Amino acid sequence: AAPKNRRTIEVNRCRRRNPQKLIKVKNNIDVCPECGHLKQKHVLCAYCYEKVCKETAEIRRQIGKQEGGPFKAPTIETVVLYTGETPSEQDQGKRIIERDRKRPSWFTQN
Amino acid sequence: ISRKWEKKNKIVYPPQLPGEPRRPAEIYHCRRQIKYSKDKMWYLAKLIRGMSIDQALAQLEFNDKKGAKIIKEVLLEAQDMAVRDHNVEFRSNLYIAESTSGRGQCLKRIRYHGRGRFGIMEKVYCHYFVKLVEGPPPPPEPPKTAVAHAKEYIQQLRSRTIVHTL
Amino acid sequence: ISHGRVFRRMGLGPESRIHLLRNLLTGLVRHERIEAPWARVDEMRGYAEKLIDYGKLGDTNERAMRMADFWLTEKDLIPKLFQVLAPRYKDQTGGYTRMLQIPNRSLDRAKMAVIEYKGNCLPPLPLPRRDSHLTLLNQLLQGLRQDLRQSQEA
Amino acid sequence: TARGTPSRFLASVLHNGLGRYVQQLQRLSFSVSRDGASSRGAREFVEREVIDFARRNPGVVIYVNSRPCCVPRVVAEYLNGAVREESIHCKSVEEISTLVQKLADQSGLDVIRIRKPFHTDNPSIQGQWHPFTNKPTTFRGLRPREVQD
Amino acid sequence: KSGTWWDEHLSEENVPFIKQLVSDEDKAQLASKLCPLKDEPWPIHPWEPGSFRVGLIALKLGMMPLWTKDGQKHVVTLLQVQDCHVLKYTSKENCNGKMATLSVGGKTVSRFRKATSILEFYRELGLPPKQ
Amino acid sequence: TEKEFMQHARKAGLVIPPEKSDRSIHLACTAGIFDAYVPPEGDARISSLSKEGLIERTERMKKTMASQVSIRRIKDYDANFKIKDFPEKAKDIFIEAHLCLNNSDHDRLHTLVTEHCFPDMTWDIKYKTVRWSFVESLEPSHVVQVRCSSMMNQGNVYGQITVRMHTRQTLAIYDRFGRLMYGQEDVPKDVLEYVVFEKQLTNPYGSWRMHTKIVPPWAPPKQPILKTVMIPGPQLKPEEEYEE
Amino acid sequence: VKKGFRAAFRFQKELERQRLLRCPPPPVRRSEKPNWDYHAEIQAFGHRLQENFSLDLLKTAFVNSCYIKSEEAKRQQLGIVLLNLKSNQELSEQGTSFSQTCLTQFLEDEYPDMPTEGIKNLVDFLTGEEVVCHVARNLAVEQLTLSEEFPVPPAVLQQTFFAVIGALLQSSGPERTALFIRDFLITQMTGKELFEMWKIINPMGLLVEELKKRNVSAPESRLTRQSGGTTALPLYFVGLYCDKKLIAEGPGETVLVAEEEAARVALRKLYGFTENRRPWNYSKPK
Amino acid sequence: QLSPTELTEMRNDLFNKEKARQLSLTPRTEKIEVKHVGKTDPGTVFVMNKNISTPYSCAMHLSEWYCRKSILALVDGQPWDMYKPLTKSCEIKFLTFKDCDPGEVNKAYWRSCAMMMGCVIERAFKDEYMVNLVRAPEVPVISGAFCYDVVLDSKLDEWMPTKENLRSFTKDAHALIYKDLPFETLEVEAKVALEIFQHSKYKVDFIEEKASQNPERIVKLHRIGDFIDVSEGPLIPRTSICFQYEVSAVHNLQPTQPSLIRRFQGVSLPVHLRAHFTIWDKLLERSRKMVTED
Ligand SMILES: [Mg+2]
Ligand SMILES: [Mg+2]
Ligand SMILES: [Zn+2]
């Protein structure tokens, strides 16, 4: 089926600029208490999620240098250690992961 | 081609008299040859039209359209330009005055169809124009109420004359 | 009409759906935290909770070993399930994993989410925290609670 | 168109002619060329006609600026401020003489559609009609089927 | 300019209390209507031919077989009536109709998920909101 | 359908013209001062003590052998030149050069200032209105230091004369929209600045033009601006942690 | 590129017209525009109005005090003989005083029942800033006026207009100048009501005072006609009854408005400024 | 004696003269290097103007988000009003309702609602009755309501407000909220402060108390539009901050025979901490109960 007549711009504006087609304003945007960057109420902060992944990748790179190959997953717990720290009383019989960097403030030692 | 929007920033006004009111700062900025449809760009430009500079950025930051990232980059460099070059005291004071998209120079390619047929595909480009005015955004026009409707209707009944006579 | 359907339609079929979740489940055990589309994370979350339930049955249980054998493509993670994850949740009876939403990826603006096993050694996620008890709204409700309890005592 | 053009009501300038008639034409500017066939008719108008025309219209100042031009023109300025420019390019003496005379009689208002061929500031003398003009009054002004006391 | 819900700003210690507070209130309000003939009831007229009385608002539980003494098998639907109360009365004059309308509500719902106009309507009636 | 954009221009270098070329760029002014001049600390106090200032200026020129012979080089190319007329001539050049900024007379400003001084004057006022005036003069200008360039550095010889000026000036700067931005158009304030001039002695058509201004380390802070400013801290990526 | 000059020339003129509409130039005095001769434009001024003006007196009628002060400052900038020009202050005072007395004479004879305050307002209206300027701008008065700022301010324009009367008063006498006021200032109240020029407050309070002077009892307001009382578009006709005799009837949307209008109708009949009054006699005096 | 309609006219004139005098004492332009210390945007330095720039002006430099959520400013460990001009270069830190320890913010908001309630008391009663404000007791937030001591005319010795009268105060308070009037704070010497409130002896005693505590004897003056009152500590920036506002009930303090002092109580919540209608009714009931400071 082919158009019988050309649709005019006046008809087109009513369809293209209809409120349904228009982008809806979002009212769920709030500032992150930690860094001040913008975030949504039901979504984790992009800036705060990126810093965790940057630190996680470095930790996972240290794991690779200790395992030294695939199919070598340890059967014990893992502990991440930074400069200026010693294994805890509960951190006995676990795999200590050394990081040559100061412990991040948001990363609480447990 | 036309590049008047760039020249709209180079106009210098005469010094104001001491009794004259403060003139709001106007900043004209644009980005040319954006690889985006102007029709799709219009929805993003219509969204932030009339908003504050910080409110516009928040809407564009969580918008999934590709032009949202492009427009946000234009607003950041326009906000920086206003303080650096246009003598604007507060960067957040700015609000969106004019925000529209325009057609850009487009390429033409051949899109192959079946039965040895073909169509002419164009690589669409668009321009984005933004104008910033210093000062709080104007309050939105309140919806017309019954008293406003009643006052106008009675005025129409009072302005009618006896037509086709003396 | 889809009333009562709990399982989603993913992959290239019912079998490919299992393999997609099996890869996510296997990748979840090895790393204890992965990022994936929200729908696939939510569909895999049920299998992650029940995998620990089979892990608590012990490696001496033949049925529990077969579930671990199938749902863990890499065979080095099977000892980890029965010796690390299962002992960790010994006191717990549920809620082994937490699912949180993350900003949509720039590739296709897909709804993304992160699923992790609780108690991992990875840096903590910026978990959503409710307003502190010292806020103005909480203080008014705290004062109301005290009076109601005090009047209840007398 | 009438719909595609503006319109106005019939009127005059400062109620002209009510107590006295004031010629609304104020100034005429003729720009003729010493050399050029287009102004041959305009030159003949200046040689014999513009002199006698100034006698009949003492309130109108006439300027005859002789400068090279291709299209001779006459500029008419009126008291109300309207400026009307007309071209006498290649017009005979009679055509210019009649054209200039028409400019003298006009009031200067825009030559557009006039809504009414009449205009009065006092349309009625016995009272403009109102719905109660021909309605009789009732005893105590009672409304239809209204009971009092 | 942003919407909010009832437990957005509540802390970890207030959420259990707020839920318990309103839960106790709903129990008390429903238990305060257990004496309708003692709290000044409306006059009880006897039955008349051509009379129409009010109905109930029941909740469909399911189905269950039921046999008769003649051997026939019938399937019935279990309609459970819970939190069914009279809401308001509108006279015939204000009804704009031949009959008189009586409002009835069924099944308690959370007060945190209702409109302000509806909440204040049930506040003066002393009943929890009905679905 | 094979048409494409004409995007083919590539970046290049502007520092040096093409090599192996007989033509070379002709320079009318030197980049900087041959020998830096450091005015004695506390010279602002000497401005009030006019009697002591007159003695010091004359003695310093005589006690400086190097600056005394540089004057001889200047008169070798221009016999009709006196050091007792130059400070009075410098005032007219200085005032006239700053009067062209209000009217944007850049055509004549090049004859009053050097090519090095021009960017410092006009670039920051490109889209701004300047209302500058010379109200009154307190102390006559004195030729502090005269030093010339080395003989035939590049085929040309340059000479620089340092002149000290202490006069009241009025400055009013308006932004692109005409709003007041800096200074007061009514109240003048004293300005104590050391103006350095230059002239290409080898060039027969050369003339003395303003070259730069000496800003002493002990100079008082300038007049604060009307508006407020913000200085943002370093932008921090998620992996980076702030240090205080 | 098509050869031809006439089409290209014609298109440039059209473009110039568009340029004027987009960016209109500031207005300028007619004197600065070409084809202007101050001596010739002022001689035709008298003949246009059919008056025997004096050139020496009329040339001093358009000269303003502000113009002289600015003109002298121009010579100081060039350091440049002295000017003996006289301003219009002397002539304006003569014209203004005569015009008010001549208008008072005309209005008091036409309307003997109009109070002195009512006559004062009408003279203050016909000689007002708006009426005088409207008449002045359509008689080529602003074009001949020598002002310091263009366009001529309404205050400056009003003062120059009376100087023309002052120049006419001396040259032609009072009888001839009396027709000049009647033909240009009286004709400005033709299509205008009494209270549209003499704006008043509380006409009912003014009506009560007028009937006391005539020893007439206070009127009683009663509803003569009524329509749509319960609607948002009512019509009330309230009538004023003195000794059970109707003196005026006024319409209005509400009762208070109708009664106020009825008072205005009563005042018009008492003062003789009704619409039915006979028109001003502009015929030549016998 | 001056009429109530003209009594506020002279108070603003003294307030305006004193406010304009402080501007005159400030030089033409003085720069203060305000340094931002916070978890958000570290290292930011604001080059502001002395006695002209306010912490709100510093917020406008960073973002509009600060301008909406920064209820109070913490300067050098001391609370600072948002519209209070800065006196010297110093570290600055903003505070919001939703913080880990919003103790200072709640007190500033709680005192602000007491001041707002006082404004509508001077307007609700008839001009024939003599209503003189006493003070705003600094009750804790956990008490459940904010109160303002008010003494009425001798004629209203036994008159008790009804349900309709209390709703009238709420409409007057909401009319004050819709106007979005800013809180203007002015620190003045006690000698100047006593001049404004000479008529009200109930305020002279309160002012003299503040002069004893402060060695410099400077008294803070806060005004909402035309209404001027004496308060302690910083307040919220604007009246639009509070969203839900309602006066609970009025109770008479004791002893009554020597003097009758009434306690106007109410509860309020800002936009940032909006509560639900069901929860809001619970706060109304508690606030109706009389509360006494410790
Ligand atoms: Mg093919
Ligand atoms: Mg479904
Ligand atoms: Zn964050």
mmCIF file of C-alpha atoms and ligand atoms in Angstrom, chain A residues 32 34-37 45 47-48, ligand 3:
data_model
loop_
_atom_site.group_PDB
_atom_site.id
_atom_site.type_symbol
_atom_site.label_atom_id
_atom_site.label_comp_id
_atom_site.label_asym_id
_atom_site.label_seq_id
_atom_site.Cartn_x
_atom_site.Cartn_y
_atom_site.Cartn_z
ATOM 1 C CA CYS A 32 25.705 11.376 45.590
ATOM 2 C CA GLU A 34 30.020 10.670 48.881
ATOM 3 C CA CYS A 35 31.468 12.354 45.780
ATOM 4 C CA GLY A 36 28.739 14.842 44.848
ATOM 5 C CA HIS A 37 28.289 13.472 41.331
ATOM 6 C CA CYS A 45 26.548 6.088 41.565
ATOM 7 C CA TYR A 47 31.568 7.534 39.804
ATOM 8 C CA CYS A 48 31.444 5.380 42.943
HETATM 9 ZN ZN ZN I 3 29.188 8.865 44.086
#
